[PDB]
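User: Is it possible to get a 3D structure for a protein together with its bound compound? The compound here is 2'-deoxyguanosine-5'-triphosphate. I've pasted both below.
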Amino acid sequence: MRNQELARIFEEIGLMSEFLGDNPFRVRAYHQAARTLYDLDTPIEEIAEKGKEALMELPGVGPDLAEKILEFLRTGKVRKHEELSRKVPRGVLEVMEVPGVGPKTARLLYEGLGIDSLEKLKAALDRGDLTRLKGFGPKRAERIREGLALAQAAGKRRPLGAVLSLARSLLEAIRALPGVERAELCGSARRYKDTVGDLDFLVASREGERAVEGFVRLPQVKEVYAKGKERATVFLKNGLQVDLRVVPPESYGAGLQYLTGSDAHSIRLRALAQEKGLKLSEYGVFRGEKRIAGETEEEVYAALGLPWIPPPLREDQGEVEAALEGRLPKLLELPQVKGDLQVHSTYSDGQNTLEELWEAAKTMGYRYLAVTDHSPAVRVAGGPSPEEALKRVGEIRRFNETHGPPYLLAGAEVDIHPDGTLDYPDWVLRELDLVLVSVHSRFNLPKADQTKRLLKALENPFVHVLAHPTARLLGRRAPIEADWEAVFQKAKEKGVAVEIDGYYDRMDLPDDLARMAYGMGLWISLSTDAHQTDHLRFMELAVGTAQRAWIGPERVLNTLDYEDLLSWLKARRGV
Ligand SMILES: Nc1nc2c(ncn2[C@H]2C[C@H](O)[C@@H](COP(=O)(O)OP(=O)(O)OP(=O)(O)O)O2)c(=O)[nH]1
Ligand SMILES: [Ca+2]
Ligand SMILES: [Ca+2]
Ligand SMILES: [Ca+2]
Ligand SMILES: [Ca+2]
Ligand SMILES: [Cl-]
Ligand SMILES: [Zn+2]
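Assistant: Yes, that's possible. Here is the predicted structure of the complex:
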């Protein structure tokens, strides 16, 4: 559907027209045309095929607008939009939009200040300039800076784990709206993508316009960017940018598929539908005018002749073909994970004592937790020395002797020196239950040298896991350059697992490299890199990554019970 695209063009013409000071009657007309297109559920093209008169049946559309609709559908553009685009630069428009701004304001801003982009705005805000620009006073000094921040974030992505819990708190409030029967967080978040744009929620309601109204008036909502009969876009007080879509209860499952995507997955499904004489839309699966499915997502998949496909797979990367052949991959699920294989303590950089870690693991129903404190080079600090590290192993053994399950594995996160040697001697490594190795320095070695360093680390027969292998930090540090094929192949041959560290700004291995490692036949270790007990919740992110990577419970260390894990760790491994 081109409905939203056309709504935007008309809206922009409205803004640009008012900026230029066109007839306020026309300005309002374009905005009313935009609302109509925003709210219109049936494809505009279907009404345009019926003629100019039929277009004119739509609220707000007269002869002038009906012709612009046809022009857009036939050419892909609207000359009037292109014309005002010649008079109106990009950032000047951007200034007028920045939530809380607008055209006439932006015109004094343009004429008065010389603003046809954004940096200038910022400049004026911080200096107090707008406090002296005619028509730019008090409570609005706040609003404009705030709007600017919202605009600048809308291009950008955040780590899934930075926003998932906040999204779920909004989900609780949405579910609690009177009139909402079901709701779910959809979009890329439901697919466990490691960074997300806006957050998208689907609601089932028999009274959609009233559900939108309750939604936009939630205590959590700061600013409404767009709203209509069945949809809205808002900004929360906490900054989250949120889209809502409402469908009737009979359509909920079709709405879940629609809003979860990916777009590429949905394109595949719509074609499968039409190939068997059906139409898949946000509102259901239809044979002619008859709705044959829609209420649950599994029903929708079934009507297309498919098993239900887990959201993390919905990327058009082989899952449609696997579903068609009745051979979806077996995927790791969160209840199968029996413990977390990288947690830190007060012995190094963690906030928690052994007792606190144990208590948290016990609450979570884990069988074990690996306490993997840093070797001395990781933290750029004197200890824990090799002697101290072994003293700690004894302390953890005594803790297990006095506590029982969940058992603590006495581990270490051992720094890899620039030359590939390890930051504890073998007499320490041999006594640890779990040896992780990782890069914490010299991140920018040439690719071939970084590869040699990692290969040398993998020569050590006491290593169990290559921890957070790329060392990336989302928003702060790029992945290290290394030949991952060479590294993973050596790890496989030596019996070393690779880690999926679900700590929210690490997400390392990333899904794509995890898919490569598992496809090459490696073992996988999941962890949260916890430095406080609140971090243990990130195991869901590591499992979501595993699902995106087509990883099953086979060859995942965390699915082994305690005894089988210890056996694996002690065993002759590799080729
Ligand atoms: N990408 C895309 N998705 C669409 C379109 N029409 C409907 N959808 C569905 C599939 C998307 O997964 C879902 C949410 O759209 P978004 O643009 O928010 O994308 P998504 O949440 O998948 O990714 P994001 O992390 O926001 O970039 O809406 C379209 O034109 N493009
Ligand atoms: Ca009309
Ligand atoms: Ca409710
Ligand atoms: Ca989204
Ligand atoms: Ca969206
Ligand atoms: Cl469902
Ligand atoms: Zn580390």
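The longest strand covers residues 407-415. Residues 187-188, 193, 196-198, 200, 258-263, 266 surround 2'-deoxyguanosine-5'-triphosphate (ligand 1) (CB under 6 Å).
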